[PDB]
Design an enzyme around this catalytic site. Structure first.
Site, PDB file in Angstrom:
ATOM      1  N   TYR B  90       9.891  -2.356  -6.292  1.00  0.00           N
ATOM      2  CA  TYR B  90      10.484  -3.334  -5.381  1.00  0.00           C
ATOM      3  C   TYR B  90       9.457  -4.319  -4.852  1.00  0.00           C
ATOM      4  O   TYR B  90       9.815  -5.142  -4.002  1.00  0.00           O
ATOM      5  CB  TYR B  90      11.167  -2.611  -4.216  1.00  0.00           C
ATOM      6  CG  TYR B  90      12.305  -1.674  -4.612  1.00  0.00           C
ATOM      7  CD1 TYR B  90      13.357  -2.141  -5.373  1.00  0.00           C
ATOM      8  CD2 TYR B  90      12.250  -0.357  -4.284  1.00  0.00           C
ATOM      9  CE1 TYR B  90      14.428  -1.296  -5.733  1.00  0.00           C
ATOM     10  CE2 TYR B  90      13.290   0.494  -4.611  1.00  0.00           C
ATOM     11  CZ  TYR B  90      14.387  -0.007  -5.286  1.00  0.00           C
ATOM     12  OH  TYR B  90      15.435   0.829  -5.648  1.00  0.00           O
ATOM     13  N   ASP B 150      11.107  10.819  -5.190  1.00  0.00           N
ATOM     14  CA  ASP B 150      10.542  11.366  -6.423  1.00  0.00           C
ATOM     15  C   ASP B 150       9.011  11.445  -6.428  1.00  0.00           C
ATOM     16  O   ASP B 150       8.445  12.334  -7.078  1.00  0.00           O
ATOM     17  CB  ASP B 150      10.956  10.515  -7.615  1.00  0.00           C
ATOM     18  CG  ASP B 150      12.361  10.784  -8.126  1.00  0.00           C
ATOM     19  OD1 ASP B 150      13.054  11.635  -7.533  1.00  0.00           O
ATOM     20  OD2 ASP B 150      12.819   9.952  -8.933  1.00  0.00           O
ATOM     21  N   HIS B 389       7.782  -0.551 -13.720  1.00  0.00           N
ATOM     22  CA  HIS B 389       9.242  -0.532 -13.664  1.00  0.00           C
ATOM     23  C   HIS B 389       9.727  -1.456 -12.553  1.00  0.00           C
ATOM     24  O   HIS B 389       8.997  -1.791 -11.620  1.00  0.00           O
ATOM     25  CB  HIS B 389       9.771   0.894 -13.515  1.00  0.00           C
ATOM     26  CG  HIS B 389       9.542   1.539 -12.197  1.00  0.00           C
ATOM     27  ND1 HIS B 389      10.252   1.169 -11.068  1.00  0.00           N
ATOM     28  CD2 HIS B 389       8.730   2.533 -11.811  1.00  0.00           C
ATOM     29  CE1 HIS B 389       9.865   1.924 -10.069  1.00  0.00           C
ATOM     30  NE2 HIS B 389       8.951   2.781 -10.439  1.00  0.00           N
ATOM     31  N   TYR B 470      21.903  -1.630  -3.176  1.00  0.00           N
ATOM     32  CA  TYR B 470      21.568  -1.053  -1.876  1.00  0.00           C
ATOM     33  C   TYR B 470      20.146  -1.436  -1.421  1.00  0.00           C
ATOM     34  O   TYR B 470      19.839  -1.250  -0.266  1.00  0.00           O
ATOM     35  CB  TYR B 470      21.717   0.486  -1.842  1.00  0.00           C
ATOM     36  CG  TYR B 470      20.463   1.310  -2.115  1.00  0.00           C
ATOM     37  CD1 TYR B 470      19.879   1.415  -3.353  1.00  0.00           C
ATOM     38  CD2 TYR B 470      19.835   1.970  -1.050  1.00  0.00           C
ATOM     39  CE1 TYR B 470      18.714   2.106  -3.541  1.00  0.00           C
ATOM     40  CE2 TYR B 470      18.656   2.678  -1.233  1.00  0.00           C
ATOM     41  CZ  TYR B 470      18.087   2.740  -2.488  1.00  0.00           C
ATOM     42  OH  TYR B 470      16.924   3.436  -2.754  1.00  0.00           O
ATOM     43  N   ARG B 471      19.344  -1.975  -2.326  1.00  0.00           N
ATOM     44  CA  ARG B 471      17.909  -2.202  -2.127  1.00  0.00           C
ATOM     45  C   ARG B 471      17.465  -3.002  -3.346  1.00  0.00           C
ATOM     46  O   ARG B 471      18.006  -2.845  -4.434  1.00  0.00           O
ATOM     47  CB  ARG B 471      17.195  -0.844  -2.123  1.00  0.00           C
ATOM     48  CG  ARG B 471      15.732  -0.820  -1.700  1.00  0.00           C
ATOM     49  CD  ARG B 471      15.295   0.627  -1.619  1.00  0.00           C
ATOM     50  NE  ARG B 471      13.876   0.828  -1.321  1.00  0.00           N
ATOM     51  CZ  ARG B 471      13.264   1.968  -1.436  1.00  0.00           C
ATOM     52  NH1 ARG B 471      13.940   3.032  -1.822  1.00  0.00           N
ATOM     53  NH2 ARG B 471      11.971   2.030  -1.148  1.00  0.00           N
TER      54      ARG B 471
HETATM   55  C1  FAD Z   1       8.197   3.849  -9.621  1.00  0.00           C
HETATM   56  C2  FAD Z   1       9.174   4.715  -8.891  1.00  0.00           C
HETATM   57  C3  FAD Z   1       9.533   4.436  -7.586  1.00  0.00           C
HETATM   58  C4  FAD Z   1      10.426   5.273  -6.885  1.00  0.00           C
HETATM   59  C5  FAD Z   1      10.978   6.381  -7.528  1.00  0.00           C
HETATM   60  C6  FAD Z   1      10.557   6.679  -8.842  1.00  0.00           C
HETATM   61  C7  FAD Z   1       9.724   5.851  -9.544  1.00  0.00           C
HETATM   62  C8  FAD Z   1       9.308   6.197 -10.953  1.00  0.00           C
HETATM   63  N1  FAD Z   1      11.808   7.278  -6.893  1.00  0.00           N
HETATM   64  C9  FAD Z   1      12.219   6.960  -5.663  1.00  0.00           C
HETATM   65  C10 FAD Z   1      13.115   7.795  -5.011  1.00  0.00           C
HETATM   66  O1  FAD Z   1      13.432   8.907  -5.418  1.00  0.00           O
HETATM   67  N2  FAD Z   1      13.474   7.434  -3.755  1.00  0.00           N
HETATM   68  C11 FAD Z   1      13.072   6.261  -3.122  1.00  0.00           C
HETATM   69  O2  FAD Z   1      13.461   5.974  -1.978  1.00  0.00           O
HETATM   70  N3  FAD Z   1      12.173   5.477  -3.773  1.00  0.00           N
HETATM   71  C12 FAD Z   1      11.757   5.820  -4.961  1.00  0.00           C
HETATM   72  N4  FAD Z   1      10.834   4.999  -5.569  1.00  0.00           N
HETATM   73  C13 FAD Z   1      10.333   3.787  -4.874  1.00  0.00           C
HETATM   74  C14 FAD Z   1       9.060   4.054  -4.060  1.00  0.00           C
HETATM   75  O3  FAD Z   1       8.185   4.970  -4.774  1.00  0.00           O
HETATM   76  C15 FAD Z   1       9.307   4.841  -2.737  1.00  0.00           C
HETATM   77  O4  FAD Z   1      10.460   4.364  -2.017  1.00  0.00           O
HETATM   78  C16 FAD Z   1       8.152   4.770  -1.730  1.00  0.00           C
HETATM   79  O5  FAD Z   1       8.160   5.857  -0.801  1.00  0.00           O
HETATM   80  C17 FAD Z   1       8.158   3.420  -0.978  1.00  0.00           C
HETATM   81  O6  FAD Z   1       6.789   3.043  -0.570  1.00  0.00           O
HETATM   82  P1  FAD Z   1       6.171   3.462   0.795  1.00  0.00           P
HETATM   83  O7  FAD Z   1       6.747   4.770   1.247  1.00  0.00           O
HETATM   84  O8  FAD Z   1       4.670   3.297   0.695  1.00  0.00           O
HETATM   85  O9  FAD Z   1       6.737   2.307   1.806  1.00  0.00           O
HETATM   86  P2  FAD Z   1       6.005   0.920   2.113  1.00  0.00           P
HETATM   87  O10 FAD Z   1       5.692   0.203   0.849  1.00  0.00           O
HETATM   88  O11 FAD Z   1       4.901   1.080   3.083  1.00  0.00           O
HETATM   89  O12 FAD Z   1       7.190   0.181   2.891  1.00  0.00           O
HETATM   90  C18 FAD Z   1       8.390  -0.273   2.266  1.00  0.00           C
HETATM   91  C19 FAD Z   1       8.946  -1.518   2.947  1.00  0.00           C
HETATM   92  O13 FAD Z   1       9.399  -1.093   4.245  1.00  0.00           O
HETATM   93  C20 FAD Z   1       9.023  -2.056   5.252  1.00  0.00           C
HETATM   94  N5  FAD Z   1       8.024  -1.512   6.153  1.00  0.00           N
HETATM   95  C21 FAD Z   1       7.218  -0.445   5.907  1.00  0.00           C
HETATM   96  N6  FAD Z   1       6.448  -0.103   6.890  1.00  0.00           N
HETATM   97  C22 FAD Z   1       6.797  -1.004   7.893  1.00  0.00           C
HETATM   98  C23 FAD Z   1       6.376  -1.028   9.232  1.00  0.00           C
HETATM   99  N7  FAD Z   1       5.472  -0.224   9.730  1.00  0.00           N
HETATM  100  N8  FAD Z   1       6.971  -1.963  10.001  1.00  0.00           N
HETATM  101  C24 FAD Z   1       7.890  -2.729   9.444  1.00  0.00           C
HETATM  102  N9  FAD Z   1       8.375  -2.835   8.188  1.00  0.00           N
HETATM  103  C25 FAD Z   1       7.791  -1.844   7.466  1.00  0.00           C
HETATM  104  C26 FAD Z   1       8.560  -3.257   4.451  1.00  0.00           C
HETATM  105  O14 FAD Z   1       9.573  -4.155   4.032  1.00  0.00           O
HETATM  106  C27 FAD Z   1       7.929  -2.612   3.258  1.00  0.00           C
HETATM  107  O15 FAD Z   1       7.796  -3.458   2.141  1.00  0.00           O
END
Ligand code: FAD
Ligand code: FAD
Ligand code: CL
Ligand code: CL
Lengths: 525, 525
Positions: B90, B150, B389, B470-471
């Site tokens: 994403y 995951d 991906h 949804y996303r």
């Molecule tokens: C490649 C992939 C990804 C994946 C997956 C399987 C594969 C092969 N399986 C997933 C699954 O089972 N479930 C799911 O929800 N996601 C899955 N993914 C996608 C990804 O790996 C995960 O979702 C991952 O946990 C997301 O990254 P992270 O946890 O590091 O979150 P982030 O990048 O920091 O934040 C995401 C977005 O949220 C907003 N954000 C985050 N923190 C803040 C704060 N502190 N304040 C305000 N906004 C915030 C932002 O928009 C950010 O981009």
């Protein structure tokens, strides 16, 4: 004197009324003093008149709602939207801001738009009551059940919009709300969630849609007039059994709560919402106060013991319902008996064993907990002449010592203001509610004023102890919001910014939840 | 050329970077091209560069976040807040708006603030990963378990804030989120829910607090920088068992979905999130594409059959986990076998019965569904060279004919771009997700551009059929929000009004979820 909106002359109000008639029809605008009496709070708080409606308008459609909102913006008329207007304990249909026009959406917007058996949901207009939905389900031989509050005459939509609650596994109404349609404060219409995706069949299936999730901002809110709402409906289990556990001592509360939590947090063996009602609640459901005591002041200990013995109830009475195949019910009931049986003096009764006078509440909970709407709890208001109530419901951790603290401090103040302590402790999953109902003679100005002053003190003292309320009455909204003042009142400042952005003319339900638009802020209304 | 915030000169940006360094420390501001490479999207979409960060700032505290936000307001610098920045599929850590500064909250705000065993919750800063929380729970002999996506290397908080999901009974992360602290767009700090009631112990017990419920407005959102978040934690059951059901035929999808729904909607016998993965997903987890085919175009039928036979898998492979005492697990597994056994060719395997390569995914799901974080699914990216991906996940009704329609339409479009159809169908309770992953060579500009153009078409075609996502990825946020346009784009207009009210200088993550502040609106950024 004729009730007028603030700042609006007789002549300007008459012009606005005619514009409303042009939209909805002449017979669907009420504005005579006699017509408006029925829309005053039935359970008034404070000696002084308050919360006076200037008119009631009953639209037939979303487009009419939009037009009403547009007229109100043009003329500066505040609007208090209701569904069925049965929010008794919290103001009834009456507006927070005196002079507001009530928009009674449910009078004519009363259709069941869809009931889907396979996916388990309903799409409703605001005028569908719990009795209406139950009648539909029964007449169509549905395999679904509803989740109702204690009284069935309110609105599935309106209840949810104040974050009202019931007692089945689907008791968190807002949780199961899925999709809504709303007219925003300048008259534009919006659908939330998958309703925003034209052609989607998932409006009532997936709540969040895409982007920031907004539906909660329309609950306990003044950001719009809701015209449609979806809600999930649970499948009815194959069997159910309800039970009562009586506990003899006031002080058993501590141990009861400490057992309730571990039995509830995994949603088993306590499958429904646990409710622990005191003897005053259960006596008031089946009897008048003068059966027990006809004197001045708080009820004496000897009279309380007579209530317990005559009704064969405890000081604290636990009600629960189990669901599923008979073997599962038997297993869970065994676990519950083993656990609560550690409290000396506990006695157990199922809904099939007990249908005496004192067991009337058990039979009512068996209906409610199975989604069978009831009005039996209206008998509470026969406790004293001209009975009414106010609801006072702090939230806390599900800890028995916290429960004892709350019991004692609320009963102490109730005694001081000459009100009986009628309470229920409930647990959701991880949170506790101290559900206090104070019953009083609504015809007595002194009693009315005592209710207002007592509850102001209760709100303050609860906040001083770290408890805030989940919902409150018109008369207490400013005081309750003022308690949520972490970070120098940051929450309210946030809500005000959003309110002024969406409602620049300050039209929708000013003061709801303590949230006033700019034109009314700081004016002691 | 150096990436700068829009409208900010090189000299002014250098001054702002010094201001940021004065807040967080010199080593906690990154701004060289090589330092920024790791914060570009790992899985870029489109041949042209996009989503380029100008700097990264790593604050140590809420107060530092407030100071960063104040500086950004003074200079007009956009901020993209992340937790761990692992939102791969994403956009990774990369900002929607090129030139934005990434605020990496999780690098130093990485404390577990509380894990409460009795009430079952955690209060977390953004840098706590699933692996971190798992390590805490294991090292303290906790009776609680987490719910992980995951991959375990992301943030319990960050995942929730994009409404991410896992697979235990607590798989809806936002549902279990309870309380948050946020820095609003001009630097004010606010706590939601019972956190707004000073001294309440119920911040992580009762989500709603008093008045309009706002926390959903901080998910998939640009309304603030979250600094603390609570989440409920489930008790670990006494035992668990995972299973695989292989289904031999592509067309079995219809019947599988129509059985999945009734077995899931009551949360039993399907107690966890049902996942139905196709053979391409399971093969990619354990093998490279060239093991099966090294030619041009879509994978031939003969190679699909070879994957099935070599791995001993079906075209559709169902994975589930059961929890509870052994007798309960046995009962539920028997029900599941009876129901899905009505599909000819279905075969059943428990997690104890598969130690072959084809069983690797079952072993992984058994970990994930028990709250044991994993990185095994990173092997998916080895399907092709330099693998990356994008995620494409429409929402629909849990209906087998709807599933077949989606399968066929997505596979047809993917075939035009020679991209494999890697999909999972899942159901929540009453909703269905079509979880599509497209894996491609991130080093190949033609593949990057194919992915962009293909997914834009997929979004459109899905919306034409009444399905919304949804996303989504940075590259698709405008297109996806444009599909939710009931009422002439009413939803987005509402979100814009709120955005401009809370963020008058247009600082926080412009364009997230398609929501642009006034200063950037209609500029094709
Ligand atoms: C490649 C992939 C990804 C994946 C997956 C399987 C594969 C092969 N399986 C997933 C699954 O089972 N479930 C799911 O929800 N996601 C899955 N993914 C996608 C990804 O790996 C995960 O979702 C991952 O946990 C997301 O990254 P992270 O946890 O590091 O979150 P982030 O990048 O920091 O934040 C995401 C977005 O949220 C907003 N954000 C985050 N923190 C803040 C704060 N502190 N304040 C305000 N906004 C915030 C932002 O928009 C950010 O981009
Ligand atoms: C006296 C009493 C009350 C009671 C109860 C027991 C007794 C003895 N037990 C309750 C219970 O178990 N659970 C519960 O949630 N409430 C209980 N109550 C209180 C009350 O009876 C019910 O909550 C009742 O269902 C509420 O009234 P109603 O359902 O008619 O709802 P309403 O008055 O129309 O609306 C309530 C407020 O919500 C907002 N609102 C409503 N409709 C709209 C629309 N269309 N658009 C915008 N806002 C709307 C307003 O703020 C309105 O005041
Ligand atoms: Cl509007
Ligand atoms: Cl601010």
């Amino acid at each position: 004197t004729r009730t007028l909106p603030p700042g609006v002359s007789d002549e300007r109000f008459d012009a606005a009324l005619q514009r409303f008639r042009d939209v909805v029809g002449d017979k669907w605008v009420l504005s005579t003093a006699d017509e408006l009496e029925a829309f005053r709070d039935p359970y008034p708080v404070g000696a002084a008149e308050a919360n006076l409606p200037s008119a009631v308008v009953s639209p037939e459609s979303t487009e009419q709602v939009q037009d009403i909102v547009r007229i109100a913006n043009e003329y500066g008329i505040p609007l208090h939207p209701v569904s069925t207007g049965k929010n008794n304990g919290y103001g009834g249909a009456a507006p927070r801001l005196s002079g507001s026009v009530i928009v009674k959406t449910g009078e004519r917007m009363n259709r069941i738009l869809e009931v889907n058996e396979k996916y388990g949901y309903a799409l409703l207009e605001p005028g569908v009551t719990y009795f209406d939905l139950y009648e539909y389900l029964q007449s169509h031989d549905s395999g679904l059940m509803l989740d109702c509050p204690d009284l069935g005459w309110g609105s599935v939509v309106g209840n949810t919009l104040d974050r009202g609650v019931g007692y089945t596994p689907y008791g968190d109404h807002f949780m199961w709300q899925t999709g809504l349609e709303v007219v925003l404060p300048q008259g534009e219409v919006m659908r939330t969630g998958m309703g925003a995706l034209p052609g989607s069949d998932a409006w009532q299936l997936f709540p969040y849609g895409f982007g920031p999730f907004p539906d909660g901002m329309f609950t306990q809110s003044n950001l719009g007039i809701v015209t449609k709402m979806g809600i999930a409906l649970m499948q009815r289990p194959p069997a159910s059994q309800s039970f009562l556990i009586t506990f003899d001592k006031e002080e058993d509360l501590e141990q009861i709560v400490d057992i309730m939590l571990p039995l509830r947090i995994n949603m088993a063996p306590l499958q429904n919402v646990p409710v622990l009602r005191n003897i005053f609640m259960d006596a008031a459901a089946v009897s008048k106060r003068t059966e027990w005591f006809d004197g001045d002041g708080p009820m004496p200990a000897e009279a309380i013991e007579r209530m317990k013995k005559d009704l064969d109830l405890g000081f604290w009475n636990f009600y629960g319902t189990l669901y599923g195949p008979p073997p599962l019910i038997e297993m869970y009931y065994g676990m519950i008996k083993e656990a609560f049986g550690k409290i000396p003096g506990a006695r157990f009764f199922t809904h099939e064993e007990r249908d005496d006078r004192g067991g009337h509440v058990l039979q009512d909970r068996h209906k409610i907990n199975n989604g069978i709407p009831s009005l039996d709890e209206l008998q509470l208001l026969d406790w004293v002449p001209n009975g009414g109530h106010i609801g006072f419901v702090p939230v806390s951790a599900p800890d028995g010592r916290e429960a004892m603290k709350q019991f004692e401090m609320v009963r102490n103040r109730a005694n001081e203001y000459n009100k009986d302590y009628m309470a229920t402790f409930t647990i959701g999953l991880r949170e506790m509610y101290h559900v206090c109902l104070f019953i009083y003679d609504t015809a007595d100005p002194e009693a009315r004023e005592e209710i207002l002053q007592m509850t102001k003190v209760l709100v303050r003292e609860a906040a001083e102890a770290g408890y805030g309320e989940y919902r409150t009455h018109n008369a207490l909204m400013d005081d309750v919001m003022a308690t949520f003042n972490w970070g120098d009142g940051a929450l309210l400042k946030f809500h005000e910014k959003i309110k002024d952005a969406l409602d620049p003319n300050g039209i929708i339900a000013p003061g709801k939840s303590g949230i006033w638009p700019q034109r009314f802020r700081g004016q002691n209304l």
